[PDB]
Amino acid sequence: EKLFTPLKVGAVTAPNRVFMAPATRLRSIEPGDIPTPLMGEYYRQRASAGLIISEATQISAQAKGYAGAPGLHSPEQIAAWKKITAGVHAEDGRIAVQLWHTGRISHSSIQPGGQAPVSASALNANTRTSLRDENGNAIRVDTTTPRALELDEIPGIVNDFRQAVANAREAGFDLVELHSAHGYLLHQFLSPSSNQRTDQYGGSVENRARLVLEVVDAVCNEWSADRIGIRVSPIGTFQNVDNGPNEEADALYLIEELAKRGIAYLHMSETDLAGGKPYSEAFRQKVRERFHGVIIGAGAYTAEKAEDLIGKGLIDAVAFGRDYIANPDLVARLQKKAELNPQRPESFYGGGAEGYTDYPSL
Ligand SMILES: Cc1cc2nc3c(=O)[nH]c(=O)nc-3n(C[C@H](O)[C@H](O)[C@H](O)COP(=O)(O)O)c2cc1C
Numbered sequence: 001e002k003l004f005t006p007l008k009v010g011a012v013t014a015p016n017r018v019f020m021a022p023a024t025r026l027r028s029i030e031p032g033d034i035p036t037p038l039m040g041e042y043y044r045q046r047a048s049a050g051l052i053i054s055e056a057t058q059i060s061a062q063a064k065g066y067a068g069a070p071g072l073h074s075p076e077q078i079a080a081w082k083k084i085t086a087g088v089h090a091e092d093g094r095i096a097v098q099l100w101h102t103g104r105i106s107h108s109s110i111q112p113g114g115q116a117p118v119s120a121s122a123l124n125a126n127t128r129t130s131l132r133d134e135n136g137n138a139i140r141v142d143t144t145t146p147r148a149l150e151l152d153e154i155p156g157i158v159n160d161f162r163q164a165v166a167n168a169r170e171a172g173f174d175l176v177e178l179h180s181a182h183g184y185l186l187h188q189f190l191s192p193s194s195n196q197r198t199d200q201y202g203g204s205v206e207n208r209a210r211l212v213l214e215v216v217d218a219v220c221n222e223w224s225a226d227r228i229g230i231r232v233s234p235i236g237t238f239q240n241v242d243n244g245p246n247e248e249a250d251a252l253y254l255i256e257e258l259a260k261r262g263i264a265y266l267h268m269s270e271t272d273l274a275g276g277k278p279y280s281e282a283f284r285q286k287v288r289e290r291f292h293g294v295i296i297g298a299g300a301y302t303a304e305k306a307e308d309l310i311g312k313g314l315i316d317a318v319a320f321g322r323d324y325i326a327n328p329d330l331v332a333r334l335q336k337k338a339e340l341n342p343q344r345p346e347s348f349y350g351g352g353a354e355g356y357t358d359y360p361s362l
Contacts, residue, residue, distance in 0.1 A: 002310045009294045010226035010264025012094050012174045014050035018331045021298050021319035022053045022098040026068030026138055026350045033071040035080040040087045041357050045328035047093030053177055056100040059164035061112050065102025067132040072167045085172035096175035097168045103185030104146035105129055119146035120188045120195040127239050138350030151199050162218040169223050181233035181269045183241035186212045192244040205250045216261050229265035236276040255290045266291050270299035284314040303334050329361040
């Protein structure tokens with residue numbers, strides 16, 4: 001078995017390969033998009049993970065697309081996240097913050113000034129996001145048509161990611177994960193289906209990857225490359241954002257470019273929750289030979305699949321989403337081959353302690 005053996009992940013060392021995947025739970029305080037003591041308890045319960053990757057966290061107010069998702073831009077947010085990271089560290093854990101801009105997967109009612117969200121192009125995502133009703137309960141609402149970012153606004157986006165990483169360092173996170181997956185802003189630029197720009201940020205793969213690579217360079221300069229990871233979902237379709245007709249070639253281009261920066265990790269979200277075609281071993285080899293840090297796989301993994309691919313040398317760690325939602329001590333359960341708690345997906349999004357901090361440890 002290798003799942004329970006240590007792994008150096010940039011500037012930190014994980015004691016096992018069983019990582020907690022990022023999971024939006026939509027329990028922050030509004031107004032202010034502030035993490036809570038209940039969220040600190042949730043993460044503290046999971047601190048035996050080789051690495052915790054937090055729920056997606058806004059880099060700015062404009063980045064917000066879901067009511068209840070936290071930010072890392074305000075002083076009050078920074079102060080609250082400092083308590084959460086302290087709690088994880090008190091339990092000898094490690095925690096990374098996943099940073100996002102939702103782009104067009106958003107709604108005007110939670111944007112600054114009530115105005116349209118932004119994206120690469122002015123095309124509706126044709127999906128829903130999650131708002132809150134007058135009693136604070138999560139509700140699904142159609143996304144608002146976005147405005148295309150003007151060329152002169154793109155430096156501000158890069159600066160927002162830079163500043164959020166600086167804030168993550170102060171807040172005590174061990175690493176950052178850039179959310180370049182799942183149809184959110186960075187992926188909106190990457191994908192030909194959502195990016196119809198005719199400037200240097202659209203067209204060719206080199207132009208479509210331009211923004212994400214500018215963000216990577218900015219955050220590496222702000223902190224250090226050994227503190228930066230990135231989540232990608234480059235094969236398949238995710239929240240109506242496909243990866244285009246040359247998805248494999250384009251993914252390998254992006255990975256080769258990320259490798260030049262010497263970042264800590266590459267986290268690949270292999271399928272969305274509705275499924276998709278599995279990665280071939282050949283494609284995993286092509287990824288492996290292009291990236292020289294840690295590769296994290298995710299998407300309906302079992303311990304068996306993780307051990308298989310780690311032992312084949314194709315990935316270094318596995319991130320579990322829903323199993324970690326329901327099992328705070330997943331590491332111990334997997335080590336002892338114990339049963340897992342049953343999942344309650346009706347409480348994944350919104351609400352309070354129920355379905356959040358009340359899944360028992362062994
Ligand atoms: C309730 C829920 C919230 C999620 N939120 C995020 C998120 O904030 N960021 C992200 O990159 N993926 C998110 N995901 C995807 C998970 O990280 C993970 O890739 C996915 O659950 C598939 O893995 P699993 O079969 O182990 O659950 C979420 C999934 C679920 C079920």
